[PDB]
Amino acid sequence: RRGSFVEMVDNLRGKSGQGYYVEMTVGSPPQTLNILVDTGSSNFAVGAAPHPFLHRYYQRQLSSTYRDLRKGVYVPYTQGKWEGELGTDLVSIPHGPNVTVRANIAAITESDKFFINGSNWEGILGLAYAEIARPDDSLEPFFDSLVKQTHVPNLFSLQLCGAGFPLNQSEVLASVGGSMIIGGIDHSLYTGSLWYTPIRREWYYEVIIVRVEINGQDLKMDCKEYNYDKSIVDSGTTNLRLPKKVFEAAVKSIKAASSTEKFPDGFWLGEQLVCWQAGTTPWNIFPVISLYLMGEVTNQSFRITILPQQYLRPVEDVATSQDDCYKFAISQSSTGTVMGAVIMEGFYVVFDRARKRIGFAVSACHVHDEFRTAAVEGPFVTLDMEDCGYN
C-alpha cells in the first residue's frame, strides 16, 4: 500500500487530553496560528486579542485582505464559552493542499475556559456541517468554503496518534501527533480494510451503533439506548462518552472483567489517576470494547474493537516518579454517545462527505502489546438497524 499524500502526513501535533492541532495561516501577509481540529463543531474561530494563555493571536488590523462582517457571535457550551466578531480573510494550511481560500473567521475577543494553559493552540477549526454553526447555518464552515472555491475533493481523513505515555508541553512541540489528509485517503496510515458506516444526518458526524460488547460479552441493551439522543464522531472531545444508562452498564461490565484488581470509585468516575510501577501496567486484566456500526449494505454491520491502551489515558504522576499512570477515559453523557479522541486514536477515520459515510480502519500508529491489537472486522448479519436510531 502506497502513501500518496506525503505533504500532509505528520501535520498534526498534540494529544487526546488537550486536543490535536494543525498549523494554518490567516491574512495578508500570512499570520501563522496553531488550530485545534474539531469534528464536533462547525466554526473557524481564532484568538484575536491578548490572553494570558496565548503567545500569539490574529491581528485583523495587519491584514490587507480582512473583511469585517459587522456581526457578533456568542458561543456558550457546557464547559466554557467564547465570543467574538465575524469577518472573512484568506486562509491557508501550510502542510495541506496548496490552495488559499476566503473563509469565515470568528475573531475571539472574550472567552472563559476555552484557551488551555500550555496547549499550544490559538484557535479551533470546526469541521462539521453548517446546521450546527453559530450564530446560524448561514455562516458557511471552512471545509464548505474550501470545497466550493477549489478542486479539493469533498473528503478528509484523520489519524490521531496517542503516544501511550505522557508528553510535556515541549515534548508535544517536538513530537508528531498524527495526520489530517485534506481531500484524500493515505494508504500508509492504516492496516487491513476500511469499513464504512452511513452518516445518518449531516449536522454533527452522526452514526448508528447497533451492538456493544465487552470482551465479547453483549451489553444486551435495546440498541436505541446506544444512540440516545445521538451518536457522533468528535475529535474535540477527549473521552469515549456514553449515555448515562449505557455508561452504568458498561462500567459494571468493565469492573467485572478487571475484578482481579480493585480500583477506587474516583478512578471509574474519570477523576483520579491510577499508577503502576514502571512497565508493569496489567493491560491483560482490562477487557477489549467492541462497537458495532451500521454497514453500507442492507442488514450488514461491522465492529471496531479498542484496547485498554486506548481507553486508559496516560497522565503524569501527581508526584515525581517513574510510575506509569493513567485516567479512565470513558465517561457519562446526557447528550448521546461521543466517539472522542481516545477512540479515534485506535483508527484511521475517513470523513467521506461526498458519499455521506465514515470509514474506519486499524491505525498504523495505535498503541498495543504483543498479545492483542485494535481491530476493524466484518461483516455481521444484523437486522432492524434503522430502529437503533433515536428520533
Ligand SMILES: NC1=N[C@@]2(c3ccns3)CN(c3ncc(F)cn3)C[C@H]2CS1
Ligand atoms: N467537540 C467539542 N468542541 C468544543 C471545544 C473543544 C475544545 N475547546 S472548545 C467547541 N464546542 C462548540 N463549538 C461551537 C458550538 F456551536 C457548540 N459547541 C463544544 C466544545 C466541547 S466538545
